[PDB]
Design a protein around this nucleic acid. Structure first.
Ligand SMILES: [Mg+2]
Ligand SMILES: [Mg+2]
Ligand SMILES: [Mg+2]
Ligand SMILES: [Mg+2]
Ligand SMILES: [Mg+2]
Ligand SMILES: [Mg+2]
Ligand SMILES: [Mg+2]
Ligand SMILES: [Mg+2]
Ligand SMILES: [Mg+2]
Ligand SMILES: [Mg+2]
Ligand SMILES: [Mg+2]
Ligand SMILES: [Mg+2]
Ligand SMILES: [Mg+2]
Ligand SMILES: [Mg+2]
Ligand SMILES: [Mg+2]
Ligand SMILES: [Mg+2]
Ligand SMILES: [Mg+2]
Ligand SMILES: [Mg+2]
Ligand SMILES: [Mg+2]
Ligand SMILES: [Mg+2]
Ligand SMILES: [Mg+2]
Ligand SMILES: [Mg+2]
Ligand SMILES: [Mg+2]
Ligand SMILES: [Mg+2]
Ligand SMILES: [Mg+2]
Ligand SMILES: [Mg+2]
Ligand SMILES: [Mg+2]
Ligand SMILES: [Mg+2]
Ligand SMILES: [Mg+2]
Ligand SMILES: [Mg+2]
Ligand SMILES: [Mg+2]
Ligand SMILES: [Mg+2]
Ligand SMILES: [Mg+2]
Ligand SMILES: [Mg+2]
Ligand SMILES: [Mg+2]
Lengths: 223, 102, 68, 43, 98
RNA sequence: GGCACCACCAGGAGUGGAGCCUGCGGCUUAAUUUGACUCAACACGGGGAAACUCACCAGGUCCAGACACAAUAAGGAUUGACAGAUUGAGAGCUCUUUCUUGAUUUUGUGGGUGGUGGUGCAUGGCCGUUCUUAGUUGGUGGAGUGAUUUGUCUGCUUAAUUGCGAUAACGAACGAGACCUUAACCUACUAAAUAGUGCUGCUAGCAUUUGCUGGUAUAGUCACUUCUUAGAGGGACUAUCGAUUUCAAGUCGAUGGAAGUUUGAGGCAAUAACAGGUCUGUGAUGCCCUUAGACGUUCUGGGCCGCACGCGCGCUACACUGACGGAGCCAGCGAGUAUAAGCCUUGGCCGAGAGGUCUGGGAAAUCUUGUGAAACUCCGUCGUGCUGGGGAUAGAGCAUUGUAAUUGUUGCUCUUCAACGAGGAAUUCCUAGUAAGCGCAAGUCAUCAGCUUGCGUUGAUUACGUCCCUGCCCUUUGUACACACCG
């Protein structure tokens, strides 16, 4: 009903947080990356970014139709008040969420870790990432647990720029002997950034010398 | 029910889109000869929550300090009600919500 | 202390080797010049780079400097 | 991958996995009666 | 679980025609606000259906997300003795958008 | 060799000595659930537990045991039940009692499922710690057969592997720094009836000089943005000038300045690691245990508070730089609701108080709210006295919250008025709006803040130095260690 300004913006955020996890659990197998809630008059546009937009929009769009119905019945929304669109992620290699979900689907198929880990190192860089580092922790046949880091290229660690040019995704992998924890850190190239800064804070680009012309003593060029 | 003194209240978490919508409405209220009052910068509200870092209760007593800035702006327009509402759809933005009160 | 770092020390001496004739011994004039010569991401690094370039310019007139 | 082998293989077999997927994925993108009525027809 | 045949019925004509059902996880709730029966009945009635491969169940933030399988439409086709006109509503081929 | 108020020097406030609050051990217990034990366990698990929470104890219910079978089963597989007994109970729990419902369902098999049950020494994630110390790495070149090494260093300097410089190295990367948030400046822009002001209408009091204090003002359909708010910018870069220095990095003084300690303060924070802590945050988890007389869940009552004792974080105080009694009277950070399940609550009226009642405002720069807070200041009483310091312990009474206050939730009134007369050995924190007082708000929260997280009022003494103690880092060195001295 009547809800305060402080309590309304938080509710929109809380709604987003709960809605986002719902897609992660339901659309985990389709490389779910993220969701964008575009509020508009007379409609609630929701844009989901996934590696595979066929599993959501399958068999005459039955799943996406049967999936928007699960949201009208839980948030007491009018059947016409919400519309869900499925959009393909443009650069699948630059999304750590897609890369972490892809790694889990390989580890659960029994593929070796080394072959699986290098499959995301090269896929991230091939998409144009400035750097990438993958950490996989857990237990594998051995009673003792271990973690292994797989770095590549250039990575920044401290300060604000990690919030601007780095996206991260952690998932738990359910194995027959325990839980495997994977961390996929991908740093995008700042030159391709279209909303924030387009370079690192300490990058200084000096222009070139425009000099080395020939000076003539003192004429006047009229027009 | 014609020309009225009409208030549009703008609230959002991020200021860039808030000022774009605010300036775009002001821009459209300039070429259209509509007298306007605003935008009025309301004192921003800092919603702060301070939790413990430890999920357990072991270690040094370290705390997080999260923040959620809420910026509120109100703009007063002197125009008929049909004109002001269509201005809102011209300057519709996902982040900023709009409420209109007479 | 006020020890300048390497991101400001090396970037300032590249300016002298490249734009010495247009530089000067005044910080205010140097500060405006480096905003059109270099792409500096932050204003604070602008007034630092120019503040050390001015010191080097003030030092070049007294004799030869190392690194330029 | 605790050996000099299977880790060589991790790299190579791993990289051919991506090279096959960048080209495949870059190709994937370049070429881009009701029911309630039956509950009311009891007249 | 002991559900009256009549109350179980309303649970079946809600899981068909809007073939998805959402139920908050509280067992003592008097009314699930969309099936005029006990909320616990809805959870346990559909726990059997997902137990016999007729609905997928998803759980997130203390909420149940029930969706009807294509195999489950056939089950309600015969057991409910309903006309063979299928396609509840989420299967009505409303088609997506591009 | 070097750095450091989690080290010291000069000092300040102390703690340890008293009473009490609270946590830990112990003792006790029907149970007094449990984790953590140097820093980095002990006002910590946001853990301020009447019920719930709850995991403990003494008892009582339910299946919320899906599903394939097999058995039983309409001549009824089973579920609910008045009355009496039973029970703590108006639990059909069970027992006499015959009624009701109708294949949902009862028994066995498998299979489940649920566990604040065990294992944090099987794990994920998170967090703490080494350590926010300043450290780490590769390309080419040099040395070595190699693992490796140099680069990554004598010296000076810095908060800093940060810089100068020396240089078989040269040129770089992460970390540092940059970055981000916040506080301090802008009479220079942009506006503001949810901010303020001068004028102006209308209007009050005091001396009449035209002055001085106000109220009113959402139509005065005024003027302005200095104070208030916040967006776009500007502004500090050690700027200029003196000293020292390898005349280098720098450092110390002045002048200007809002700001010259990284301008003050924080957020983030590298390469690896710990059997560090949590499965008592998770519908995060592998395995083990249990799964109908449950270790699931629920109901009732008790316990987590229990008291010969040892220890830690603190609060009141030991008086006169003070207690009371009147009077003066100034902040900032914040929070706030609807057919609820009841929010912040002014203003009026009762009441010594605590508190009660009637209206109204506020989903909020609008109202609570200028939160008229406390220390503080003035004037009085007291007069070195276990005194009017101090307010435990206890008796009697009055209200609030809550189903429920007994083992007093808390508040108020009268009475009792205890140790304590500045604290041994030891030991903690701290360098400027800082320490110390002093309160206020938010979190927990129906009630309860001696607790934390912040905020502001008043506001210092003493260094601006060192390796003497202590801890850590680096270099050299020894090694029979490499699961790395817990060897
Ligand atoms: Mg950096
Ligand atoms: Mg930093
Ligand atoms: Mg001392
Ligand atoms: Mg004291
Ligand atoms: Mg506490
Ligand atoms: Mg209890
Ligand atoms: Mg109990
Ligand atoms: Mg107990
Ligand atoms: Mg239990
Ligand atoms: Mg551990
Ligand atoms: Mg661990
Ligand atoms: Mg080399
Ligand atoms: Mg070499
Ligand atoms: Mg370095
Ligand atoms: Mg760096
Ligand atoms: Mg007004
Ligand atoms: Mg007046
Ligand atoms: Mg700082
Ligand atoms: Mg241990
Ligand atoms: Mg558990
Ligand atoms: Mg659990
Ligand atoms: Mg919890
Ligand atoms: Mg039991
Ligand atoms: Mg306790
Ligand atoms: Mg007791
Ligand atoms: Mg403490
Ligand atoms: Mg007094
Ligand atoms: Mg106010
Ligand atoms: Mg006395
Ligand atoms: Mg007393
Ligand atoms: Mg001392
Ligand atoms: Mg000490
Ligand atoms: Mg209590
Ligand atoms: Mg409180
Ligand atoms: Mg050795």
């Amino acid at each position: 009903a009547i809800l305060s300004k402080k309590k309304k913006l938080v509710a929109d955020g809380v709604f987003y947080a709960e809605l986002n996890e719902f897609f992660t659990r339901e659309l985990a197998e389709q490389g779910y990356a993220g969701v964008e809630v575009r509020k508009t008059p007379s409609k609630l546009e929701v844009i989901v970014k996934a590696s595979n937009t066929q599993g959501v929009l399958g068999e005459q769009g039955r799943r996406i139709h049967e999936l928007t119905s699960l949201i009208v019945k839980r948030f007491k929304l009018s059947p016409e008040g919400i519309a869900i669109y499925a959009e393909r992620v443009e650069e699948r290699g630059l999304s750590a969420a897609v890369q972490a979900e892809a790694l889990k689907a390989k580890l659960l198929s029994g593929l070796p870790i080394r072959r699986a880990a290098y499959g995301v190192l090269r896929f991230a860089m091939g998409a144009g990432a400035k750097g990438v580092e993958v950490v996989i922790s857990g237990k594998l046949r051995a009673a003792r647990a271990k973690s292994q880091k797989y770095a590549d290229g250039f990575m920044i660690h401290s300060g604000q720029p990690t919030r601007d040019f780095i996206d991260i995704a952690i998932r738990h992998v359910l194995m027959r002997q325990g839980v495997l924890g994977i961390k996929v850190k991908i740093m995008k190239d700042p030159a391709a950034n279209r909303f924030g800064p387009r370079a690192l804070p300490d990058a200084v680009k000096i222009a070139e010398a425009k000099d080395e012309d020939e000076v003539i003593p003192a004429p006047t060029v009229k027009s | 029910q014609q020309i009225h003194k009409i208030r549009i209240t703008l609230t959002s978490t991020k200021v860039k889109q808030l000022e774009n919508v605010s300036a775009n409405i002001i821009r459209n209220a300039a070429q259209y000869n509509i007298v306007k009052k605003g935008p009025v910068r309301m004192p921003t509200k800092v919603l702060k929550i301070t939790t413990r870092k430890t999920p357990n209760g072991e270690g040094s007593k370290t705390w997080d300090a999260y923040e959620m800035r809420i910026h509120k702006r109100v703009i007063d327009l002197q125009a008929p009600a049909s004109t002001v509402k269509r201005i809102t759809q011209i300057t519709i933005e996902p982040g900023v919500d709009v409420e209109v009160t007479i | 202390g006020r020890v300048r770092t390497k991101t400001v020390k090396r970037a300032s001496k590249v300016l002298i080797e490249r734009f010495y004739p247009k530089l000067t011994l005044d910080f205010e004039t140097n500060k405006r010049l480096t905003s059109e010569i270099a792409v500096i991401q932050s204003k604070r690094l602008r007034n630092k780079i120019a503040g050390y370039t001015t010191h080097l310019m003030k030092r070049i007139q007294k004799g030869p400097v190392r690194g330029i | 991958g605790q050996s000099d082998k299977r880790e060589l293989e991790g790299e190579v077999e791993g990289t051919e996995d991506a090279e096959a997927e960048l080209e495949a994925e870059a190709e994937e993108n370049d070429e881009s009666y009701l029911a309630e009525l039956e509950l009311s027809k009891q007249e | 679980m002991l559900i009256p045949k009549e109350d179980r019925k309303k649970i079946h004509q809600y899981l068909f025609q809007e073939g998805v059902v959402v139920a908050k996880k509280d067992f003592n709730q008097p009314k699930h606000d969309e099936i005029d029966t006990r909320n616990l009945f809805v959870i346990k009635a559909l726990q059997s259906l997902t137990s016999k491969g007729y609905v997928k169940t998803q759980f997130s933030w203390q909420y149940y997300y029930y969706t009807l399988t294509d195999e489950g439409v056939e089950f309600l086709r015969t057991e409910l003795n309903i006309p063979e006109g299928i396609l509840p509503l989420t299967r009505l081929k409303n088609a997506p958008a591009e």
